């Protein structure tokens, strides 16, 4: 037969709105991009993705939160010589610091006053401001080491809630509040006026509603505070004399987030009216007169912009923005109006939420804390498990023959026997307290009974017991970004597995002797791994979009000519291939897929010859077929020797900025 | 049946006037629509019916005008795009052959009023 | 509708008096103006009902090509017994 294709649009797995973008390292234009730069994206359903902007923005890790959890602000902290530290507020009274290894909170510091509305990090990163609902600004001593947080000082109180914070330096702390005012406190310890609010400024109020100052930044090249409020106006204030220099009436509704570049020649700003405005001071006359101009204005987002940030280095100068529509947008910093931009896909499934089983023609898919199963026929939803004893979900696998499902999150996992009772299923928990106590990242089913478990604390069990696993050399990037030496992937069928950690290490393991035989042999982050039983091979693909294969018991000649005979589609690819499998009718052809395309490479053929992180910066160290007509893509797989399963996505009020009518 | 005979004759290569005659033979409304729904392309049925309705814009048969109005109802996404060199003057001379009835509908309705008045007063004065 | 039955009978019966009157149009101007403005727009609503009826029977015949299909097409469902076997806290309970 020819390939018959099930273009499924059943799964309505929808992410949530980006509420906070942050960059791990600050800008430093005249030095190279550090190998430890990570962008962090906190959504509104409570999960924190961490992306690396090397070679078109791959996604390294994801830290999910559970039911009724959100995340409103998040800040990085990297004292030079120590590990990265990631703090985040939710809609609650605590700050939550996460250890990047496990993907769990390692500290929930309850701030001692009210519900936190904003968070900011000191310059030199030893103190932390949390601005709370009862008008307080609380200082948290951060420099005690990673994990230990102390209370320092509650600054002088006020009535209205402080909605945004910024620091001048180690010295002063600026805060925009919900009464339309902008206070300036002094956090300079061992002064006479420590903690008391030195100044108050009032923005031009709205006529028929209350005004809220939503975004405040400090501009260090000049000595100003930029501030966006809920009238749309953007004001620049001289810090000394605490007074306005110039006001622009830029947006039509609120200005939720605004940011600046390194040398403060530009200020970018955005809000609910979904345009991004650029205010420039680049002319020598502008710099000697201290006069910003409203330079430009772009309409790129669909609904809102709730978060904006900027990075600028020797081989990277981009501002990143995201909002109520769930996608990310990258623009250039010094070439905003002129240059190009890239709207990311709303999901790039580096961690999958859908898998199928060929027997019973069935497919399982898990959104937040519920799984669902349907069969092909049309299609019919046969069962679902809205387990609400759970709070957060993570990865899942089904037994071949479709008997037992296992769902698993970083706190526990749970296994359910299934029996098809006709037009429905019957699902029963089968108790195992070892599974109920273990942390699981990946479960991948050696047999109908045996599974292999990768724990969040780097343990590899075999249940239904222990694989010896050698240690990795801890270099500076491994001590800086503390999840690089963590097992991302493991793929197995028939007693032979292979694990993969993102330092460029991909290690096989025989399930019998439980010995490594390492084949690290790599240069950067590994996107996907699939084992070919034909050729006795492992197939790794890295973030640079190269396909390597190696043998087992280094790379084959097919790899050796394929890598540099690779097609132009792969050489101009933008979305990384997150899934590989092999064809079912032929044991040697392999069939892979990214988030916007589907390809298939042939095992023997070779074809003839004749807005990124682009610098000389290193990685994290110091017949051929191609289609894209199923581009909003979530997951693909096979069922039998002729058909294919292509499950994708399909689609909210927004500020109407109308197209010209004719 | 005879609709299939007319379909095969009009689809083979030739006999278009005889094809419209065989269409006028059985001449169902439902089969008239079905013969438009079945065929995927026409051999300038619009051209031959254009010249027929141009040479007789006043015929008592409703067959070819019924066929033209159902062709224009069901296939006019493609009659404006099949051909535009002879078809342009075809629709031009068809439109100028048919506009005169729009010019003289008021006088015919006037004469209909005349005659209804005359016949009703003649029925009225009927000599007891 | 109802009253012009009266006006056609007045012309038919009194067909001599108001042909012997010297200024017919000047004496019943309001009838002439009313009928002129009623019958002046007849080509316009001719074009209107041609264009309207064309689309009307166009969707009528296209929907009569499949008019029996929407009588048993709706096979929709709801939160069935999978929800009862789904509630894992209620599965520990009952």
């Amino acid at each position: 037969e020819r390939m018959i294709v099930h273009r499924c649009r059943f799964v309505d797995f929808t992410p949530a709105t980006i509420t906070s973008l942050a960059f791990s390292h600050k800008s430093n234009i005249n030095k190279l991009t550090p190998s430890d730069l990570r962008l962090a994206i906190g959504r509104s359903n409570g999960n924190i993705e961490i992306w690396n902007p090397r070679n078109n923005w791959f996604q390294e890790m994801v830290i999910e939160g559970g039911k009724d959890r959100s995340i409103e602000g998040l800040c990085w902290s990297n004292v030079n010589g120590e590990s990265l530290r990631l703090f985040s507020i939710g809609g609650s009274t605590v700050v939550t610091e996460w250890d990047l290894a496990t993907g769990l909170p390692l500290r929930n510091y309850d701030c001692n006053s009210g519900v936190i509305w904003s968070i900011s990090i000191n310059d030199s990163q030893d103190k932390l401001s949390v601005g709370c609902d009862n008008g307080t600004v609380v200082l948290i001593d951060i420099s005690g080491g990673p994990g230990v947080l102390e209370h320092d000082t509650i600054l002088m109180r006020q009535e209205a809630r402080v909605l945004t914070l910024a620091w001048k330096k180690d010295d002063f702390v600026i805060g925009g509040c919900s009464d339309g005012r902008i206070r300036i406190w002094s956090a300079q310890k061992n002064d006479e006026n420590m903690g008391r609010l030195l100044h108050t400024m009032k923005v031009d109020k709205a006529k028929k509603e209350s005004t809220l100052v939503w975004s405040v930044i400090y501009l260090p090249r000049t000595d100003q505070i930029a501030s966006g409020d809920s009238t749309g106006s953007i004001k620049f204030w001289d810090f000394q004399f605490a007074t306005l220099n110039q006001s622009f009436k830029a947006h039509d509704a609120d200005v939720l987030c605004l940011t600046t570049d390194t040398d403060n020649n530009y200020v970018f700003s955005a809000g609910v009216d979904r345009k991004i405005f650029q205010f420039s001071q680049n002319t020598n006359k502008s710099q000697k007169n201290n006069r910003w101009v409203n330079s430009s204005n772009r309409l790129l987002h669909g609904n809102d912009i709730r978060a904006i940030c900027a990075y600028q280095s020797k081989g990277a100068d981009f501002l990143v923005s995201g909002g109520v529509e769930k996608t990310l947008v990258i623009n250039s910093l010094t070439s905003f109006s002129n240059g190009n931009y890239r709207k990311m896909p709303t999901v790039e499934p580096y961690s999958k939420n859908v898998l199928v089983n060929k027997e019973q023609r069935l497919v399982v898919s898990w959104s937040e804390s519920t799984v669902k199963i349907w069969t092909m026929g049309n299609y019919k939803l046969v069962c679902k498990l809205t387990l609400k004893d759970d709070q957060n979900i993570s990865t899942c696998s089904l037994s071949p023959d479709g008997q037992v499902l296992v769902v698993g999150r970083p706190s526990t996992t749970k296994v359910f026997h299934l029996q098809p009772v006709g037009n429905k299923l019957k699902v029963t928990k089968l108790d195992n307290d070892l599974l109920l106590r273990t942390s699981t990242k990946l479960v991948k089913f050696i047999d109908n009974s045996k599974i292999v478990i990768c724990s969040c604390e780097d343990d590899v069990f075999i249940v239904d017991q222990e694989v010896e696993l050698l240690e990795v050399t801890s270099t500076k990037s491994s001590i800086k970004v503390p999840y690089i030496n963590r097992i991302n992937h493991l793929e197995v069928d028939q007693n032979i597995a292979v694990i993969s950690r993102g330092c460029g290490v991909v290690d096989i393991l025989d399930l019998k002797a439980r010995i490594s035989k390492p084949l690290a042999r790599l240069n950067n982050f590994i996107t996907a791994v699939h084992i070919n039983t034909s050729r006795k091979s492992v197939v790794v693909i890295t973030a640079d979009n190269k396909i390597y294969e190696f043998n087992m018991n280094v790379l084959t000649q097919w790899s050796k000519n394929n890598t540099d005979n690779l097609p132009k589609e792969w050489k101009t690819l933008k979305e990384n291939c997150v899934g590989i499998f092999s064809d079912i009718e032929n044991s040697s052809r392999l069939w892979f897929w990214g988030a916007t395309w589907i390809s298939r490479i042939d095992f023997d053929v070779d074809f003839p010859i004749n807005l990124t992180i682009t610098d000389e910066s290193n990685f994290m160290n110091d017949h051929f077929f191609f289609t894209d007509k199923y581009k909003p893509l979530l997951f693909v797989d096979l069922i039998s020797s002729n058909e294919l399963a292509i499950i994708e996505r399909n689609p909210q009020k927004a500020f109407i900025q109308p197209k010209l009518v004719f | 049946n005879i609709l299939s005979s007319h379909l095969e004759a009009n689809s083979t290569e030739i006999l278009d006037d005889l094809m419209s005659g065989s269409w006028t033979e059985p001449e169902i409304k439902k089969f008239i629509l079905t013969k438009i729904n079945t065929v995927d392309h026409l051999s300038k049925i619009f051209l031959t019916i254009s010249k027929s309705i141009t040479q007789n814009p006043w015929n008592e048969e409703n067959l070819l005008p019924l066929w033209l109005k159902w062709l224009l109802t069901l296939k006019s996404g493609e009659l404006n795009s099949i051909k535009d060199k002879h078809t342009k003057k075809n629709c031009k001379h068809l439109k100028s052959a048919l506009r005169s009835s729009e010019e003289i509908l008021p006088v015919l309705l006037g004469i209909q009023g005349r005659l209804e008045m005359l016949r009703r007063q003649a029925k009225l004065r009927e000599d007891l | 509708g109802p009253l012009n039955v009266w006006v056609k009978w007045c012309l038919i019966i009194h067909g001599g008096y108001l042909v012997s009157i010297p200024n017919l149009m000047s004496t019943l101007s309001s009838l002439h103006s009313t009928l002129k403005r009623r019958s002046d727009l007849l080509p316009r609503l001719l074009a209107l009902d041609a264009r309207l009826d064309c689309t009307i029977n166009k969707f009528k015949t296209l929907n009569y090509e499949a008019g029996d299909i929407h009588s048993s097409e709706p096979v929709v469902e709801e939160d069935e017994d999978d929800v009862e076997y789904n509630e894992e806290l209620d599965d520990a309970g009952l």
Partner: peptide, 28 residues
Amino acid sequence: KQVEIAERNTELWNLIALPTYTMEYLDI
């Protein structure tokens, strides 16, 4: 029948999406 022919001629004068699941094919 003249007003009928005239009405029809004048009519001639003034006369002058994605489902949730498909199944298709692609190249081998």
